[PDB]
Amino acid sequence: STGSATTTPIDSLDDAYITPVQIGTPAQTLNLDFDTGSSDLWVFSSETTASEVDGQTIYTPSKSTTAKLLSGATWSISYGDGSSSSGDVYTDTVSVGGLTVTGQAVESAKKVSSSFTEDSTIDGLLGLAFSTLNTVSPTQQKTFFDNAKASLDSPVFTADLGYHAPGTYNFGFIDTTAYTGSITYTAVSTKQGFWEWTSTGYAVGSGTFKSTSIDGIADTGTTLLYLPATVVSAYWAQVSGAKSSSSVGGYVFPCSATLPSFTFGVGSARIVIPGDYIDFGPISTGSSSCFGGIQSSAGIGINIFGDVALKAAFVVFNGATTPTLGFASK
């Protein structure tokens, strides 16, 4: 089998991407944030505290003839941005772009933190990291990809995120029309549960490529590119007036600037992020200070190849017995 679904930016900045997902019988369609940095499929629901729902579409398990309470199971998750959610668990039929999994754990939120409530466009998350990170207790549950894998034509999914435009998540096949050149594959460590890999270096604008190993995670659920402070300083030093602002929480730059590109290495191959992809707009409405799309990872504990990086590439998440990642230009 295969599946293919369009993913759409939630706003004019590409702060996140939503993909429609069918849950239950009859189908209830929710727009989920596909997150290769986490491993829970959780949704706003008829069980979510009413004051914490503000415009989201909810899953109502009592209206699904295929929903079954997973007795005794609870979940609770906290994300790198400080947000969180928790609740109980159902199993139900879940379909993405024509690919159907029966018995998928659908984690129903009883509580969500303010940032989720405040984002009316995201009805939940669909985790695509390794199932060892799944938070369901006392019986850990598998991701949608893990459950689908054996049925897929090939044990892979691909992320083709758009810049200020829709893109595609494919399951079970590699669309050879969706990228240019060849796909360069690179090793993955699953030891932390992430799609963790090592970039071979970077360049700023037309500058020379610096060969240096940068371990990080391919994370569709993170907006920006988080890299070591040395790399990030080298980038922003090429932008007149750019500075790190403790009050804003990262590098800002004059909105009048033209940003240089940023290149990252995948083996001997190179992925170029155009400068425009690094502009996240005014820090507050009407400000002439703009927020940068490349930020330091120094306070995180891990480097994160988020959407800013991934949207410059066609990315293969290869879930073969030894997983690997593939990157192609497009």
UniProtKB/Swiss-Prot annotation:
Belongs to the peptidase A1 family. It catalyses: Hydrolysis of proteins with specificity similar to that of pepsin A, prefers hydrophobic residues at P1 and P1', but does not cleave 14-Ala-|-Leu-15 in the B chain of insulin or Z-Glu-Tyr. Clots milk. It comes from the Eukaryota. One of its GO terms (biological process) is proteolysis. One of its GO terms (molecular function) is aspartic-type endopeptidase activity. The gene is EAPA. This is Endothiapepsin. Keywords: Aspartyl protease, Disulfide bond, Hydrolase, Protease, Signal, Zymogen. Disulfide bonds join C255-C290. It comes from Cryphonectria parasitica. Its EC number is 3.4.23.22. The chain holds residues 90 to 419 of 419 of the full protein. The active site is at D35, S199. Residues 17-328 form the Peptidase A1 domain. The keyword Signal applies.
